[PDB]
Amino acid sequence: TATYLKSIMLPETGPASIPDDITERHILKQETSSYNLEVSESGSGILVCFPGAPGSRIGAHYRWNANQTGLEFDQWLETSQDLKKAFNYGRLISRKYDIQSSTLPAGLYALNGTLNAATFEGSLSEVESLTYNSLMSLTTNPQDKVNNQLVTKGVTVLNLPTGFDKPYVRLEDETPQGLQSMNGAKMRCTAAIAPRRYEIDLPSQRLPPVPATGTLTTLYEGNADIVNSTTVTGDINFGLARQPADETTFHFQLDFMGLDNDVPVVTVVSSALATTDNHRGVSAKMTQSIPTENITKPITRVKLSYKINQQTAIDNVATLGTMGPASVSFSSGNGNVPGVLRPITLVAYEKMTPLSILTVAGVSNYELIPNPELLKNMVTRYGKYDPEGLNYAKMILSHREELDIRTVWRTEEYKERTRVFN
Amino acid sequence: TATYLKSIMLPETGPASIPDDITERHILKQETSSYNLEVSESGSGILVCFPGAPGSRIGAHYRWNANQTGLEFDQWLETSQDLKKAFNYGRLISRKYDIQSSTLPAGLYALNGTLNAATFEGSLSEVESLTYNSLMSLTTNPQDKVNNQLVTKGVTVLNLPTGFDKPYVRLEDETPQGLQSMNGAKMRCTAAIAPRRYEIDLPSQRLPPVPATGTLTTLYEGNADIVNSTTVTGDINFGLARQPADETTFHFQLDFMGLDNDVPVVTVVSSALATTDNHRGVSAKMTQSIPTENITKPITRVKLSYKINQQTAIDNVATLGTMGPASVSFSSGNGNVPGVLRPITLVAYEKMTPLSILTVAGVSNYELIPNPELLKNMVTRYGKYDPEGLNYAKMILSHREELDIRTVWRTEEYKERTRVFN
Amino acid sequence: KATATYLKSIMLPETGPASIPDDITERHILKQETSSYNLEVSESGSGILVCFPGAPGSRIGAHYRWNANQTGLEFDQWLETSQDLKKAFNYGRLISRKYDIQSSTLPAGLYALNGTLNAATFEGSLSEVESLTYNSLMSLTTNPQDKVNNQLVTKGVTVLNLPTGFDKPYVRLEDETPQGLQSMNGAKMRCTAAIAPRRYEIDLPSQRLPPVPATGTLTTLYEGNADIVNSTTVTGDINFGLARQPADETTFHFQLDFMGLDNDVPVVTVVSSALATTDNHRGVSAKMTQSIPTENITKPITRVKLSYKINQQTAIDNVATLGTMGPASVSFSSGNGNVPGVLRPITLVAYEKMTPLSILTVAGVSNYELIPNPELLKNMVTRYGKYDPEGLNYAKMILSHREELDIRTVWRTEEYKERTRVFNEITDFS
Amino acid sequence: TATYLKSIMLPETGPASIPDDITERHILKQETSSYNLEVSESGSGILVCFPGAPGSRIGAHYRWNANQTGLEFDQWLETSQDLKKAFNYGRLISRKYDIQSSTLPAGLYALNGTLNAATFEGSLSEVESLTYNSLMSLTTNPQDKVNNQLVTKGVTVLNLPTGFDKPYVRLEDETPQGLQSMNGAKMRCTAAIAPRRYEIDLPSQRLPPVPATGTLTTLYEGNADIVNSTTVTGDINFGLARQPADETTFHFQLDFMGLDNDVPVVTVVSSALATTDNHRGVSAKMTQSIPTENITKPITRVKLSYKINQQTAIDNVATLGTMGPASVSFSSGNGNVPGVLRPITLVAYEKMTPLSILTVAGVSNYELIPNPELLKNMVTRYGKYDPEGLNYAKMILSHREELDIRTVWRTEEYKERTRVFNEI
């Protein structure tokens, strides 16, 4: 008994079936991650942990440039194997990170570098400043924060479950295909189980005047965050004042960006054509679908903008909404599943010794469902019937202030404070 | 212990956390709502209650016209605070309404009025007639109806949970927008979790003829309820019979109306064009996205139309369904979340004294999740760990008939039968 | 008690004044000034009473009434004292205040009248209220001692004033100064209130000005919420550089009109002009050096709208980016608005659905310690306080224990009337 | 009782409400800072502290260039949370910094660095020489200095109050704005309570001749310090000696700088067309308003310059004061509030190995008044009513010298010498 709470508290002692009502025929599997990140020239950076995200991507790694004016995206933090090549559905029992430098000092003093870590029950886009200083100002729970820990003593980022009846989620696997496919066109059973919808929702005023032809004047830019395949559904209707002398195109842009620099991860264009016939209602439909492989890095910003090609019609005010709401939306995968996009843990290091080694070390315990190619050889069973295992975890989570269990640790307060679940 | 049932029966005794499986870090907040409703000169009107809606709108009010020929929308019933300005996610614990008049104007001797209240497991597009005598047939459950109740004694509308593992729902809040937006564009993380889709499915026969140019003849009209943002998908495709002599437009309409009058709440237009080339493959696509702020009143009817702009094209039958099924879909928000749009509680008052006042006092109990601005200055924790208490609140929901645990009460029998729950 | 004389003036402001026993010790004059209003309820049967509890002065509140169809409000009148203080005095603090709002129609039969009354104390400035609505003002505070909802309009509500701070300064009262016989006809200098101002800055960004639709059509630049209640000075400038030198002389009006919270006709507007010419087309500064007397502030100001317009039909494509000759902003500082009590905190009393043509009575009372003007300074003796050492210290523990003692800024007038007798009103016989 | 002096003495033990006369409903909130400053190649620098500033900017950091001829602004130091976004008014209760190195870079096996510190009472622009060993000659109070302290042991800076009835200060936050705002404009409720005003007072003699057209001659250069929103008022009025053959503009600058390097932090402009009619009464109005996001780094200098745009106008002497005193004033925020702009505490470091880390750890305590959105959900209340409260705190400040209560400590002395104050 109580072999599921022990797997939450100690995620490296192996997986265990979530003893809840969503009982399927699954596979218990533990997957690890091992990185040796080379500290950049400014010795500073931030690594975003998604501790409850069921999948292969468990984190991202950004690093400050020399002047610490901006960040650069180093790489994702995946697991050992890409789970979608042998599994179609998956959950997450447990996860644990060990962010800790591996540079043993010879002398009696430590090398220079510290760690701030905060569990922010929001999303990456909702953070206003990503900086080692302004991380304590993301929560107020004393169990979600750790400040000024030596980088050679390390922080353990536990994952405390956010809900207990989470659904098995598609892993973006690939379907069989024929031999007459194009060359590299594939098809995926992507994630769509509880989407996260956004909507730019422009008002019914005139379009801003563009300074020149083909200059891409901005219409809106906000903070929406995206991790996997999205569908863009909307339209941008507008009526011109006077019928155009020539015919104008009205290019619309909608590019997506990251939190580090203004080079668009994905851009998605729609076009119109203002003609003498339809000069009173023109519509540019956004019906584009964005696969999950074009998202090379996390997305935290969108920007909608437009440009016109005709030299004239630069004074053709073109009021919006002449055929309806004039709104553009997009929906994304499993954004609104507890664990994806929310919550997140931020671990930031400052002034680590230039060209030294930070070693992240992750452990995940999944509940997976093999793909048909693997059912031939893998036996799939049910949960092991723990009747009390979830009440015990609910009791542990409800008293996390007296017992001082926490999402983020000091790795030595952790290594010492959890040997009672053995 | 047994403190979650107390918050169901006595929504005024404050909120208690749901002991179900979804365990988050939340905020227990109570909201009140108090309205003094002017009664029209007819005296009749009708209230709509959404006793399970987790949002910030808890009902609507319609007032019959001078001779009960039609209704008119009065206003939305909502809570005191606008939850979507300080919170992101939320789910409802319990709610309670209290109706009465019990007061009359300066010099008057006659106080007359009666109440019919019945809980309906439909969605208010399902109701056929909202008249005072009608809505006693909306259910055949004994403990869901109250008829011929004196307006001075009033009805208390309770809320019984239709399910327990409800998900937290995005409250349609604005996202942090950068500069360079145009003037008033704004993006909201709308609701997507468990939507409600309506397929139109026009049959692939001849398009009915227009009597004249630009007169908007009907293609379909029906009942479908929408309260939050929605996205419209599909396309009407059709091939002309011979060939267009000159270019025609085929302007499609798709208006949305409420139950009171026939002025559309919001209209989404899509305009095709039949040229000589595509004269057998004309297609009018629907991609519009309706923000949840264009829904001013409860939408209950949908009507699709079309019209042409050329005289020569009254003939040229223009058969549907050449390129595909020629259908039109639209999905909305949390339509299929149990609590939104289901169930409804109708409360009909009948011939109150003209120019008298009806009193609606509601108290909701939510479990909210703050927004990043509020996370820094507010502690968010887990539930109180009632191990039982869900079973204790589910035994009552099953023995409700031998316990007479009602959804609609007479205020005087409620105010004394529920004192057993401390 | 020998002590508890100052506290007795806060809890029972009807029983006359009592000098504030703080460190601001001047030779002053104790005065009690009363307010009385019988308000004619309008056909909407609804309205709002914006109280100003800690406001030292004559104006102690405002009365707004909803229009017929309950869409927007209308400004009835200022709620002030019976006699004008600034005629006889020069300086003043406020010791305590109390408002009593009540329906004086009082039905004859067995059923009460249809009128209900909401009241909440908001630690804001009447521009920080997103919406004034009978339902909307029950979530303005979580403090249970600042909220009363669903009070029957005949039983009434009491709005007690609790001091926020104790070393408040003596503020000038906008008395007008002596003048020679050569003034034109209506000029008058006033010693206006300027001690601890509240400042706003509109802060335009340094980029292209929005395009104007036509000539003289007043394009909007900014509109937000900034409450002003007395005299103010506008200080700023707007500068811009034209794309290319103009074909003619463009004027570029700027409007900056202040607006109340009820209708969009400006309470006061003030215009500046910058004539862009051939030579100085690269920098065109519109100086904003304005001073609005409190005599122009007719009703409470809650919103602002900065707008502009050009007069040449040409030059309508001269994009005119801002910020050339510096930050390109405009500012206006108003009176003594950061003095605690002025503009914050305020109390809102909403009456909803009363009988039209019924009567709503309002009976204020305000104890001041004032300083006479020279005219009656030759007849009144001004002296120091009463020397109660523990007077302030006794009131400090009352405010700190106001939860367990249940000391409220908003009452039901039957729990106020019955719960304020421990503060002596009982005449212990000799 | 005695629970407020404990907060002044040991700020790390949490905030406590001030027992003074300013009694308003408020929120007690403790905010931390954490900084790892990078020592440059000169191994030197200076770390300014604003121990009593109720805002969010609690200090700047400077470095000395290679040959120590001048400084360079590195960065502001500031609380983790941006207070203005969730609060309108605030008062500071306590604030303690903490400075050390205690660690070493890659290829180093010996650490070295010494550390001067002194509690000034001017305003960061009244100091004349700001070198490592000159800031010892800025005070004579033994309780306000520490000399040649090893950087590995550390200097603690403590905030002893200067006054007790400080008002709640506006935190410069946003106001609600409706639609129709142009693109990115924004109105803020800035600080104005107790301003600080300078005036440049030019004499009514002739303007100094300009060398060439458009060459920016200098009229005044001096030391004034600004940290927030500033209004400029005044005018320069002059009369040309004779008829101007061609109209001149007379560009007047008045730009502001920091102490690091003479690049303008904020520059302003005013022009005065001298035409043939008003050549007896030309005047250049100055009516600008400088918001607080333009003050990117501390300002400690102003320069008022001018220039002409015509060739013939280099003669025609243009004497000042023809229509009045001809001065240019500017009043800034709430400079004269005790705690803002004074007292300053400077901590200088030198002889440190380049690329080593200088750790700063601040912890502040505030009384804050939540903004309307946060006000709807959090409850505000009054002080905790300690009647004596201040007399105990006021007693220690008077017995400062015999009890040795310092603003600038050395850490090992601070850690143990102040354990006395652990009692509730």
Residue numbers in the entry:
A (entry chain E), B (entry chain D): 7 to 428
C (entry chain C): 5 to 434
D (entry chain B): 7 to 430
Task: Reproduce passages from the article.
The infectious pancreatic necrosis virus (IPNV), a member of the Aquabirnavirus, can infect diverse salmonid species, leading to lethal outcomes characterized by pancreatic necrosis and catarrhal enteritis. Birnaviruses have a bi-segmented dsRNA genome. On the contrary, VP2s assemble into a 60–70 nm T=13 icosahedral single-layer capsid to protect the RNPs. The VP2 subunits are organized into three domains: the α-helix-rich N and C-terminal base (B) domain located on the capsid interior; the conserved β-barrel jelly roll fold shell (S) domain; and the unique β-barrel jelly roll fold projection (P) domain, which is situated on the capsid exterior.
